Amino acid sequence: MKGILGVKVGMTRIFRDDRAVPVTVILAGPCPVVQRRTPEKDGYTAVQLGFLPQNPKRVNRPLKGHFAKAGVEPVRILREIRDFNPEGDTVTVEIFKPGERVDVTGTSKGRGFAGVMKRWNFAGGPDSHGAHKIHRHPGSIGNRKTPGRVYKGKKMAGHYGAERVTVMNLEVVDVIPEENLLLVKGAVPGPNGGLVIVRETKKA
Amino acid sequence: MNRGALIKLVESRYVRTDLPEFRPGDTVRVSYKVKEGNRTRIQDFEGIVIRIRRNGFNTTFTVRKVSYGVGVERIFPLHSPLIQKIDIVQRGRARRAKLYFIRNLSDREIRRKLRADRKRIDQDRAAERAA
Amino acid sequence: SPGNCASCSNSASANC
Amino acid sequence: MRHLKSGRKLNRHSSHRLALYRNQAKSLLTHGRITTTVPKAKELRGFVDHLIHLAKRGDLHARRLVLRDLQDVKLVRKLFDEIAPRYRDRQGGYTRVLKLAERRRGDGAPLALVELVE
Amino acid sequence: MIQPQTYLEVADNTGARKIMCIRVLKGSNAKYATVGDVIVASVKEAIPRGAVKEGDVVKAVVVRTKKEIKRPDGSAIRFDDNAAVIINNQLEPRGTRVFGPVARELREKGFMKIVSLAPEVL
Amino acid sequence: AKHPVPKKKTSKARRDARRSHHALTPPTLVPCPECKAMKPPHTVCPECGYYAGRKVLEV
RNA sequence: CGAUGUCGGCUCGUCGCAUCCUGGGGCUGAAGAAGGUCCCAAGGGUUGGGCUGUUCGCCCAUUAAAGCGGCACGCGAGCUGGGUUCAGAACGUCGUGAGACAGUUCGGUCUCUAUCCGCCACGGGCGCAGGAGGCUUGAGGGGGGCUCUUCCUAGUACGAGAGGACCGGAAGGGACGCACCUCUGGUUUCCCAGCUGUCCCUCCAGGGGCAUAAGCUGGGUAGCCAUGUGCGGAAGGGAUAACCGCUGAAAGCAUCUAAGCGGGAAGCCCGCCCCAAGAUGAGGCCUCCCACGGCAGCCGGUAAGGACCCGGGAAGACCACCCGGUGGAUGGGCCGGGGGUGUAAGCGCCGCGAGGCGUUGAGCCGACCGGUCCCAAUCGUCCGAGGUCU
RNA sequence: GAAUGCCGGCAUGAGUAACGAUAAAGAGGGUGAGAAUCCCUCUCGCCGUAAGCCCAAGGGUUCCUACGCAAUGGUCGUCAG
RNA sequence: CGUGAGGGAAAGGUGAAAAGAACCCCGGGAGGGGAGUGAAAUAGAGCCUGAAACCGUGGGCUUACAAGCAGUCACGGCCCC
């Protein structure tokens, strides 16, 4: 189960065998390992990865001692890849070669307070034929005296997006080790500049 | 990082410079590699370009022609490797960047609006006097 | 409407 | 949503907001310093910085561009002849905003000064 | 992007002149038809003494659409009308000529006779 | 609508529990490095007119 | 009856299973294919249209299928108001009449503010025996769960022929779901241009206002988007249902069963995706501070840290979250690039003139990718451990 | 102790809805204990078969000036019918 | 209030005596703090007595794993006499 931290940079399309393949480009490595979770010590198996160098003038003493025991420069993000134990002490884009398939996890874009039609694709109301101030309204939310309440999990308005999303089984179209670049076919959650996690796929 | 530069870096392998410059209003012949049945030929599509939307490597352009009584618009990626070559056939002088208005015009109404870009025609003939 | 005069509850505005 | 959008709205429609910025431009470029609300102050910076920059360029085209917003020919003369030369070697940043420590009594609005720099 | 109520010109000599889609024959509930897709249609306008007359329920394959259609090579193509060719249950054209260009997507979907009878295949 | 309305008078306990979030927070004040008066940070001093070390406005 | 709003539609679901389809079966008057009938199964699915207020129903075109019921004939403090159902009017009919008719006909007021429970979201407080900054385990929840066509096997098995498979293997779809903006296609309230009338600046030229909350028109970046793009349903393991066995008595035979052991569903449990230690059963790991001064307690000064304030942010109603605060590229300006518009003004030349040509892809130029300390994040303040007991 | 009782007082809803045409504002300078709101100047916008002017009815000192701001003014007020 | 006929309120109390608080202080004023009057000033004119709802300040006890017509019975803890 290989994985690596990265930043989404943006999308384009390349040409491969007279086909245009939409790609999103990810700057993955290099990811130093700063702690290993062992079954003896922690109860599971994972690597805590670091990513992106940080101004030591910004890193407090508790964190600075965590990096010290690792022998690692201060870094902006720590994330674990579960069930991943790399041989080296540095993980780079070259753990993927073109043709492989990955799952990419990001923070989706945040719509704030989303109405019922954007959040849940409700049908709204009519826009004429007498419709009275309910054009984007959700309609009924229940029954009557039985059960005289509203189901937990009822689809209603509220905050939407800015949440963890994994999109799965993305073809790795290319890797450019010289630049820590990772091209992947399709779309990836979140904005340009967002932090993403790239993991070997769980589909078969 | 510089995210814009990295994307330009990714695209650089695919950028083309062999193709000639043109402008909306220019009549043009795109020699294009199509696949049919089992083999691949080169099909020419000749028409007026009515639009050039620019996004660097991702720029595309739209070419309009009338075929056997029917309007046909074709959108090409400017850096597509399926484009063998582009022949300028004529230079027209447009007044605006997008020429959708010619869709609702007769053949003579178009000829009156898009007259020969005499200036850039002389620029073409002045070039190709390279010796 | 209840409202008008065939029914008489739940359904229209002030008049009384 | 509002993602990556530039430009305050200031609860004015399109033509009122443009009038709002032009009138502060005239007042700032007349008195060298004015007091407004902090949000208005912050938006003024850009609008006047561009006018001053054109004054630094000095050509007739620049003057006519500046005239579209400022209108007053005398005022444009002051900007071209007396204001712009103060900034010949300044790479932008011809205005500053500093926050005032008290508010309006009648609506609690937070106040600021916008002034031309030296 | 043809759907029920959509009018289409007939690009053949079956005698039909205008047909109005009433089904896109693509599974349980397809919303739209594109080039290559078969529709059921009512013949709203036909020339006298043709093979088909007004009011007939016919089948037809869509050959040109005004919505542009995209291609794996990154290009697209778009026509100035929506046009169809009337067919029989073996997908063969019911007339003997077809008029105007047709989209190359027909060849893939298996409408070989229409492609060859077409004056231009774009 | 059908004009919703409070079912029961709110108890003294409940009305006051609603207001457990209403206390003002005191103004945040720093000493002015020039005249030592207490003033809001990041504002020109209203007592002596100084900011960033220099005189900026008439008091 | 000091009011429990009355049909239907729309919207939003959710449940039952007497199952319409899809999955698994036994019997068949099951050759194959396709049916019939019964059993198991509620995971998911169950189209668009013409008529009518209609529910229902009939009909058209499709489909794997176009299921039946409950939830106050689900749902009017969610909408509608066609029907029903006041007052007007008329027809047929009844009545001498006034009037009357689950008979018909045309018309006919549907109430801005949610206290409590519930529901969707988001915080504040305290707690989790020292106080802190990080990274996590997943108890327990939730989401999802669909299906078709063609081809190969193979024109094989089967059948006189017509027709035509099981098993196994490929390819391509429909609807739905999540994310996304490279492309396609929208918007793009001032990013650019053209245009009319009028008033104005300053007479010409050049401009500004107003004509909408853009005067109108042609375009249009980022963003937000679907019509566009990627990806999903699984696979796989386990335990089962009907059903089929192995071995096997009671009962010398027989029996799937009484001892024991197999096989076996789209369903059940895992697996996938998301939430999650207020999981008070308050978990775990890494790192940091530490024995402060005064009579499980008190008041103070601090430690590690945090907050306040400020510059902001594809984060956001406020709050929260995230980044930055001069040892700084956080916003604003400026510069370069991108992008849009499509050749500014001024001048020169041709024309009586409207205009035209050149200077010139010029000029203008939001957000996008960057650089640059020019401007502003000055200066600071206040909280904050000394660790209860066998 | 109850009469949807009568009179009065005070609560709840709640710091909630609202503050009455979407013609629109900005700065500077004054006055003052106090100013988004009063005065003055400049800029901006709105009406212009009126949102300008003159009669009639109705109203009845609301007119002018000085001095005032408790209440009236949907905020404020140094201003004002 | 109603065009009119006509309908039709609310509102009493300083003290024996104004001796009704000079003067000083903060405040623009209102208001208060001293001084002073009085047997009495929570008799200070918003004045005899001054109940209740209602609102607030201070203190004791108590409360953030808990199911409630709010009480009642028991025991325990803390506080007070």
Ligand SMILES: [Mg+2]
């Ligand atoms: Mg982009």
Ligand SMILES: [Mg+2]
């Ligand atoms: Mg490649």
Ligand SMILES: [Mg+2]
């Ligand atoms: Mg970061």
Ligand SMILES: [Mg+2]
């Ligand atoms: Mg992200």
Ligand SMILES: [Mg+2]
């Ligand atoms: Mg992440």
Ligand SMILES: [Mg+2]
């Ligand atoms: Mg986000």
Ligand SMILES: [Mg+2]
């Ligand atoms: Mg999105």
Ligand SMILES: [Mg+2]
């Ligand atoms: Mg909605």
Ligand SMILES: [Mg+2]
């Ligand atoms: Mg939607």
Ligand SMILES: [Mg+2]
């Ligand atoms: Mg959305």
Ligand SMILES: [Mg+2]
């Ligand atoms: Mg959605």
Ligand SMILES: [Mg+2]
């Ligand atoms: Mg959602």
Ligand SMILES: [Mg+2]
């Ligand atoms: Mg709808």
Ligand SMILES: [Mg+2]
């Ligand atoms: Mg609909």
Ligand SMILES: [Mg+2]
């Ligand atoms: Mg709609």
Ligand SMILES: [Mg+2]
């Ligand atoms: Mg509407």
